[PDB]
CSV table of C-alpha atoms and ligand atoms in Angstrom, one decimal:
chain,number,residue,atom,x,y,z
A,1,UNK,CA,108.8,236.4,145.5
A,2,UNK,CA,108.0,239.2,148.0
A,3,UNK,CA,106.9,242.2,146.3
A,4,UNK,CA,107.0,245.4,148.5
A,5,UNK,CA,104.7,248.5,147.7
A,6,UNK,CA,106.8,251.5,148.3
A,7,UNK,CA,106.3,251.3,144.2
A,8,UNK,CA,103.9,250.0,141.8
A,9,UNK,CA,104.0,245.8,141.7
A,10,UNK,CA,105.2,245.7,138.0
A,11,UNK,CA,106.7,242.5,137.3
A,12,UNK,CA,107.2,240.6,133.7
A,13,UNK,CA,104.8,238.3,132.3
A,14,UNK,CA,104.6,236.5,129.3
A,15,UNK,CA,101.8,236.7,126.7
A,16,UNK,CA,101.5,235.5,123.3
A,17,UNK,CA,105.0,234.1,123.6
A,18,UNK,CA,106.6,238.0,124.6
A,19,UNK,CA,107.6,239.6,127.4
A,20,UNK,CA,105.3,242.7,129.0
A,21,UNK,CA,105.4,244.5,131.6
A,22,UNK,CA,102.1,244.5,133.7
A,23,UNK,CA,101.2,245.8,137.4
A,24,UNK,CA,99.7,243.6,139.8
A,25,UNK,CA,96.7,244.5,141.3
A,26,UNK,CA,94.3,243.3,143.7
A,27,UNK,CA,92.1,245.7,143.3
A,28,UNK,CA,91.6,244.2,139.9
A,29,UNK,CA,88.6,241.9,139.1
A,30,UNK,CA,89.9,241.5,135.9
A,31,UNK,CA,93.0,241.2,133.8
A,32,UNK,CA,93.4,244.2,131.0
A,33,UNK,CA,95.9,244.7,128.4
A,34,UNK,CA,96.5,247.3,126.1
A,35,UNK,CA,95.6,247.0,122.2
A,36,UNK,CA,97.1,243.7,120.6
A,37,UNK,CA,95.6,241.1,118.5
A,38,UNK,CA,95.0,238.0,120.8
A,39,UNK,CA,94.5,234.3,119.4
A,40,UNK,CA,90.5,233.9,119.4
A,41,UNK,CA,86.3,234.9,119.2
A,42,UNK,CA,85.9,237.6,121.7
A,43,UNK,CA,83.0,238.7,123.8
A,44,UNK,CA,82.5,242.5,124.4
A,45,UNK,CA,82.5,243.4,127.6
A,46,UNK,CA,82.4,246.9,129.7
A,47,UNK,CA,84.7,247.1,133.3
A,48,UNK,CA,84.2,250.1,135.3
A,49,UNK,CA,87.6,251.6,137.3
A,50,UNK,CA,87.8,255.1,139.3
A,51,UNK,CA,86.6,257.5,136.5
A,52,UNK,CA,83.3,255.5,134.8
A,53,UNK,CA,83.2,253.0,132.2
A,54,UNK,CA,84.9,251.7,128.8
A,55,UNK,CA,84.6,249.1,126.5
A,56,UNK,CA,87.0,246.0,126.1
A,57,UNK,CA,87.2,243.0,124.5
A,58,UNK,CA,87.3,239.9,126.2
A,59,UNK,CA,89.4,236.4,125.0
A,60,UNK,CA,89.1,233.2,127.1
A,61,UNK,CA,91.9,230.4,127.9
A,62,UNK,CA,94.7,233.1,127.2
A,63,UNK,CA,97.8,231.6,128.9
A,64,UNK,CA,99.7,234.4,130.5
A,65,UNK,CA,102.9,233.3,132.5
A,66,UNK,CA,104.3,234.7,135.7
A,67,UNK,CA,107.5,233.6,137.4
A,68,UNK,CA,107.2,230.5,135.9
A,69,UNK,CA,103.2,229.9,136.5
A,70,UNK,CA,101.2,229.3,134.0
A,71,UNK,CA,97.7,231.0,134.6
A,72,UNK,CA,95.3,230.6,132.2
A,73,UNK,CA,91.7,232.3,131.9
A,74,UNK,CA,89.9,235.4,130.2
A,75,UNK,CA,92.0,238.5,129.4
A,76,UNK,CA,90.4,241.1,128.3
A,77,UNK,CA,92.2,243.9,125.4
A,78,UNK,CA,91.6,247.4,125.7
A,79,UNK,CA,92.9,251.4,124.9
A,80,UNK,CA,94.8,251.2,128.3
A,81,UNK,CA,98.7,252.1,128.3
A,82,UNK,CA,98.9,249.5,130.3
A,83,UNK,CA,99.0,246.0,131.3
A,84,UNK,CA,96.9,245.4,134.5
A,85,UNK,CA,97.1,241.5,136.0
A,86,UNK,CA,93.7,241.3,138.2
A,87,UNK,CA,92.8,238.4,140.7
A,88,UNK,CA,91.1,236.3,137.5
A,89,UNK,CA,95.2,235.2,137.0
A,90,UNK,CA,96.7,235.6,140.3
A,91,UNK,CA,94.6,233.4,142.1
A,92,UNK,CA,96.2,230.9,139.5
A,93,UNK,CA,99.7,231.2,140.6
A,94,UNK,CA,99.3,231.1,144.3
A,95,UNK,CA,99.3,235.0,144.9
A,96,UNK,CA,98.1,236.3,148.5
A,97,UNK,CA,98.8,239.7,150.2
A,98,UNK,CA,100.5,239.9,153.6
A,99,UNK,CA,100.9,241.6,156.6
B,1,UNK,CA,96.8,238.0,158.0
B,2,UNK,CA,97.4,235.7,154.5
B,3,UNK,CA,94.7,237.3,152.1
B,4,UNK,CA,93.8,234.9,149.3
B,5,UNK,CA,92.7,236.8,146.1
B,6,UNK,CA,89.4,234.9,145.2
B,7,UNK,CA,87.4,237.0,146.5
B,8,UNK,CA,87.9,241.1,146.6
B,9,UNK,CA,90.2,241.7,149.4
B,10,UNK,CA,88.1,243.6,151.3
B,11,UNK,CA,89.0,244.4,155.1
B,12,UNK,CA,86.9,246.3,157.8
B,13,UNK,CA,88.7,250.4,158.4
B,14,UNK,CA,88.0,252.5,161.2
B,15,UNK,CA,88.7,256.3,159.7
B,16,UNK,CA,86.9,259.3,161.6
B,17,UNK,CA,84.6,257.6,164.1
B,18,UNK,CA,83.8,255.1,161.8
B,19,UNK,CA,83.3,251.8,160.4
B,20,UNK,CA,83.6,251.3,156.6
B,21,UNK,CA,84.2,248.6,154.2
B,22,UNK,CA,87.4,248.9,152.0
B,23,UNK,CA,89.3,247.3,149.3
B,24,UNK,CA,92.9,246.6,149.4
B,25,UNK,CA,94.3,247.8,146.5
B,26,UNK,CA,97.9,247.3,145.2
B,27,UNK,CA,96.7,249.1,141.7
B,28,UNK,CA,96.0,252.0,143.8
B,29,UNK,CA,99.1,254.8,144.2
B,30,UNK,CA,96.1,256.8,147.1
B,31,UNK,CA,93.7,256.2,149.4
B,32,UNK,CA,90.8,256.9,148.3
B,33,UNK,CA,87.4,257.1,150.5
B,34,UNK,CA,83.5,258.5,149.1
B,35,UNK,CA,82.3,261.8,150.5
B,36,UNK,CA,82.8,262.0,154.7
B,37,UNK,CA,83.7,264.4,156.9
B,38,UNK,CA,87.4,264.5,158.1
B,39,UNK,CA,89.0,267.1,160.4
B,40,UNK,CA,91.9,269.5,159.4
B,41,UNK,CA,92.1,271.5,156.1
B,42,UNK,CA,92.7,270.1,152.7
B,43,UNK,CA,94.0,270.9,149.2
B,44,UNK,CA,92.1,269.9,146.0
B,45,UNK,CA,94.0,266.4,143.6
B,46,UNK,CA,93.2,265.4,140.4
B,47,UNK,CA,93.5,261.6,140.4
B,48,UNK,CA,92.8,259.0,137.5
B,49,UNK,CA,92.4,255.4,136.2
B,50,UNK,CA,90.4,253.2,134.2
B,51,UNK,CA,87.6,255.7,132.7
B,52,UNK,CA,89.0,258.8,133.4
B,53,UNK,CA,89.6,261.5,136.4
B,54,UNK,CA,87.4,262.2,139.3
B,55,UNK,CA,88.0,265.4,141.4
B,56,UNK,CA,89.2,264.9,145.1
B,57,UNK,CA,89.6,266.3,148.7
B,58,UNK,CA,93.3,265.4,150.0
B,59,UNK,CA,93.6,265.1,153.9
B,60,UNK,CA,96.8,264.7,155.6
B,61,UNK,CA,97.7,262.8,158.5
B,62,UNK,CA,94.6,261.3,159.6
B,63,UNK,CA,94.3,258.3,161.8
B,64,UNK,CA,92.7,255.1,159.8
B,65,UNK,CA,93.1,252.1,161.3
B,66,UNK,CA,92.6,248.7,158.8
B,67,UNK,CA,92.0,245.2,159.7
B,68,UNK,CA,93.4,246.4,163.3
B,69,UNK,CA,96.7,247.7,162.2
B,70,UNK,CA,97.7,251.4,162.6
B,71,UNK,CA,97.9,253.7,160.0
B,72,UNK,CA,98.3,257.8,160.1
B,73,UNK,CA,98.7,259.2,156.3
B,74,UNK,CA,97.0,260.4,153.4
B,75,UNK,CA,93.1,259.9,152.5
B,76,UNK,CA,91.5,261.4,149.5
B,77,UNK,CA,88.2,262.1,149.7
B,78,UNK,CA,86.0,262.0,146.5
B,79,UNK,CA,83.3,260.4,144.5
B,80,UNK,CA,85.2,257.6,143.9
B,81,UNK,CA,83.4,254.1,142.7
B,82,UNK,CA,84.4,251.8,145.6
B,83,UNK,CA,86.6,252.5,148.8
B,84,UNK,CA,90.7,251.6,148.2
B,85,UNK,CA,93.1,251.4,150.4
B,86,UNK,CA,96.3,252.5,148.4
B,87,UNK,CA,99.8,251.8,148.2
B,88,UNK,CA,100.7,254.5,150.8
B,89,UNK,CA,98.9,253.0,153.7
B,90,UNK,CA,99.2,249.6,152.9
B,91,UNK,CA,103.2,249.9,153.0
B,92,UNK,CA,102.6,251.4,156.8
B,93,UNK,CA,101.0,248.4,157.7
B,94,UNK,CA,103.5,246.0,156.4
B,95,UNK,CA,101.4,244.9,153.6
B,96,UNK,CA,103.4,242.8,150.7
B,97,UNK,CA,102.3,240.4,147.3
B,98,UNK,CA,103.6,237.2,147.6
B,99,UNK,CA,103.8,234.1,145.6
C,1,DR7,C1,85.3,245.7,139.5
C,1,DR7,O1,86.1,246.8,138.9
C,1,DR7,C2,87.4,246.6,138.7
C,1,DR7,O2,88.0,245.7,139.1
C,1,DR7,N1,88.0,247.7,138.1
C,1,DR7,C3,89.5,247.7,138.0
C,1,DR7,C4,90.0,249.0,138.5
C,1,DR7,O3,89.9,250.1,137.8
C,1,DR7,N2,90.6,248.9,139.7
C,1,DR7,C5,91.0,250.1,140.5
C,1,DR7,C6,90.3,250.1,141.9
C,1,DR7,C7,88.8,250.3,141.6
C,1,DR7,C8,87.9,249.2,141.4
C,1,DR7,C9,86.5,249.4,141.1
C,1,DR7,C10,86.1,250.8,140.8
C,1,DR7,C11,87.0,251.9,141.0
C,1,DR7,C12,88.4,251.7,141.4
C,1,DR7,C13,92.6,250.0,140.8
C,1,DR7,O4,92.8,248.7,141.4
C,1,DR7,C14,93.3,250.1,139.5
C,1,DR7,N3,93.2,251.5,139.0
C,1,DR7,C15,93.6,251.8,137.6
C,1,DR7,C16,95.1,251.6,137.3
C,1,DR7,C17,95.7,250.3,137.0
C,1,DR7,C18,97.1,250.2,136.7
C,1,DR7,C19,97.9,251.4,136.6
C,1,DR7,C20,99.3,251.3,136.1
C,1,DR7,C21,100.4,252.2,136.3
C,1,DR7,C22,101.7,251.9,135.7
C,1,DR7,C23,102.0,250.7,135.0
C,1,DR7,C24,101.0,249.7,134.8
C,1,DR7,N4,99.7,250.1,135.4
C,1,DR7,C25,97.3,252.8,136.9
C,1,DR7,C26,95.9,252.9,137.2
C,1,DR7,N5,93.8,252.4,139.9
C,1,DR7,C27,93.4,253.6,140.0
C,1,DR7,O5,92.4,254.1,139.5
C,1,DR7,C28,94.2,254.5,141.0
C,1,DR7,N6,95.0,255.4,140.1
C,1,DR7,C29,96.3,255.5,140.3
C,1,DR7,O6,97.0,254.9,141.2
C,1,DR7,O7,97.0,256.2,139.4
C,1,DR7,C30,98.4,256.5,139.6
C,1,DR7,C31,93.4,255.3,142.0
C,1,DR7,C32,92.4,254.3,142.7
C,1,DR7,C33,94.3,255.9,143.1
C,1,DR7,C34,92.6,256.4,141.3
C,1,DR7,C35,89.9,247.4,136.5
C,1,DR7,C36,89.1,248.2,135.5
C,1,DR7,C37,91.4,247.6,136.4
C,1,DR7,C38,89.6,245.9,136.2
């Protein structure tokens, strides 16, 4: 698809076999998910956004899918309210910004 | 241009007589830019993501031109981590996700 930005890029993805909502963002290194229990040993791991620092833990080979690409790589699970899909995943199905 | 997402997307911005590195970012509702000098006066905005809030300067209508293309809007000015170009500029320019 073409996703414009006159809103935030929230598309559906699929993770541990649900549907989520998630925002897709470049300006992500990383991709961060609210609290759930993910399939796995985890890694801690801290990742740094506007306001400082906070802890998250970090799964590897979690298959999110997204319009129909399977991406497949480390997600990390944190206190967010949010899901956040960062380049880790996007790079995996082929995303590029445009103008 | 097609920006690939394996690296940071970062592009080169001309904003008040200067050069500056910034990072196109689709997580980003602002524009957001560390302490400089911009003309005009300003009002105070909270702002926040990952970590928490940082306080800011918000300018209106200045001139900002990225990766050559021509932009006149918002810029907040603040300590932030790393210099974003936000939604509200980057829909000026045309900018769009695609895969
Ligand atoms: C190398 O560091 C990172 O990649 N840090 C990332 C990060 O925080 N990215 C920032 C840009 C950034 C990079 C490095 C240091 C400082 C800032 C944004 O891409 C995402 N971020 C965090 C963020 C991500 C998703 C959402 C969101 C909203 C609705 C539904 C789903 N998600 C909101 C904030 N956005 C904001 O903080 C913006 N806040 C904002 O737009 O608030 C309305 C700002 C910028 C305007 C302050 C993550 C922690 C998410 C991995």
């Amino acid at each position: 698809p073409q996703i414009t930005l006159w809103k935030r890029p929230i598309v559906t993805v699929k993770i541990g076999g649900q549907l989520k909502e998630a925002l897709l963002d470049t300006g992500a290194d990383d991709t961060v998910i609210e609290e759930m229990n993910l399939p796995g040993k985890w890694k801690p791991k801290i990742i740094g956004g506007i306001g400082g620092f906070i802890k998250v833990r970090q799964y590897d080979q979690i298959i999110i899918e997204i319009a129909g690409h399977k991406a497949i790589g480390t997600v990390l699970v944190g206190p967010t309210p949010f899901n956040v899909i960062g380049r880790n995943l996007m790079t995996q199905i082929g995303a590029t910004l445009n103008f």
